[PDB]
């Protein structure tokens, strides 16, 4: 009855932990470029985990791992919200479900469900598709409900947690400029 929860960023982790109790977290995001930004986001997650004694596992981040992600999304390099993001989130959640099976967790989820930008129907579709493939149950919750999003905002402010202004990939950084 344990869940492995992919973590995109510390602000969305803060929103999520208002609602989840006995979870292992999995910080895996080869979509975040460049390395300096990956490390800044990772350190914010580490700060939250130390503050609240969370159990966080950190996934692979390497030139090889980034190349695998880029292959998955390359054919739609379109805007945010399109087939490119469907491929990106499926890549992240596939790796998470793989890890969940390896570590004995019967369920998996993602803090992307707490992000106000993301498309919840798209994420739930991806999660349920991956559930069918790996036999790890996808746990869906609107993590922003119950006032948790605003609750994540005030914890982020009090803790001094880095709050990014682009989704993470190079494409989203360019779309930020335009
Ligand atoms: N700082 C912060 N970023 C978030 C949060 N939730 C999702 N994000 C990500 O940060 C990106 C910031 O993009 P923008 O704020 O320019 O729209 C979003 O598109 C999303 O991918 C959050 O709660 N706080
Ligand atoms: S905008 Fe976000 S979800 Fe879409 S491809 Fe880039 S990192 Fe992935
Ligand atoms: Cl995010
Ligand atoms: Fe996030």
The dihedral of CA 123, 153, 36, 95: what is its sign?
Answer: negative
Ligand 1 contact via 131 beta carbon (within 6 Å): no
Report the separation in Å between the CA atom of 177 and the middle of ligand 4, taken as the mean of its atom positions: 20
Nearest-atom number in ligand 2 for the CA of 29 is 7
* Beta carbons of 24 and 57 less than 8 angstroms apart: yes
Query: Is 169 annotated for ligand binding?
Result: no
- Using CB atoms within 10 A of its CB, is residue 116 exposed (0-12), middle (13-18) or buried (19+)? exposed
For residue 85, say whether it is annotated as part of any ligand binding site: yes
Rg (CA), the chain: 15
Q: How far is the CA of 167 from the centre of ligand 4 (A)?
A: 8
> For residues 59-75, b (16+ Cβ closer than 10 Å) or e, as one string?
bebeeebbeebbebbee
Report d(CA 176, CA 163) in Å as an integer: 15
Q: CA-to-CA distance for 45 and 102, rounded, in angstroms?
A: 23
Torsion, Cα of 17, 86, 101, 140 (10° steps) = 40
**Rounded to an integer, what distance in angstroms lies between the CA atom of residue 178 and that of residue 174?**
7
Contact 107, 4 (CB under 8 A): yes
C-alpha span between 1 and 151 (Å, rounded)? 26
Which residue blocks in the chain are alpha helix, DSSP H?
Answer: 10-17, 35-52, 63-73, 83-102, 120-134, 148-159, 170-177
Residue whose CA lies nearest to ligand 2 atom number 5: 85
Q: Is the peptide bond before 34 cis (omega within 30 degrees of 0)?
A: yes
What are the beta bridge partners of residue 55? none
- 79-115 burial code (b ≥16 CB/10 A, e <16): ebeeebbbbbbbbbbbbbbbbbeeeebebbbbbbbbb
Task: Return all residues near 160 (Cβ < 8 A) that are at least 6 apart.
Answer: 47
Domains parsed from the chain with CATH numbers? 3-177 (3.40.50)
């Amino acid at each position: 009855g344990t869940v492995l929860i992919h973590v995109c960023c510390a602000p969305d982790l803060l929103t999520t932990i208002f609602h989840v109790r006995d979870a292992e977290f999995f910080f895996y995001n080869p979509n975040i470029q460049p390395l300096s930004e990956y490390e800044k986001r990772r350190e914010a997650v580490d700060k939250v985990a130390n503050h609240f004694s969370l159990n966080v596992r950190y996934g692979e981040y390497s030139t090889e791992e980034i190349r695998k992600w880029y292959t998955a999304v390359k054919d739609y390099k379109l805007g945010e919200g399109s087939k490119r993001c469907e491929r990106c989130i499926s890549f992240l959640l596939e790796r998470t479900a793989q890890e969940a099976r390896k570590r004995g967790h019967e369920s998996f989820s993602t803090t992307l469900l707490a992000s106000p930008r993301k498309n919840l129907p798209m994420i739930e579709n991806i999660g349920k598709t991956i559930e069918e493939k790996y036999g790890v149950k996808f746990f869906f919750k609107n993590f922003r409900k119950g006032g948790a999003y605003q609750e994540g905002v005030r914890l982020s402010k009090e803790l001094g947690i880095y709050r990014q202004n682009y989704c993470g990939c190079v494409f989203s950084l360019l779309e930020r400029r335009e």
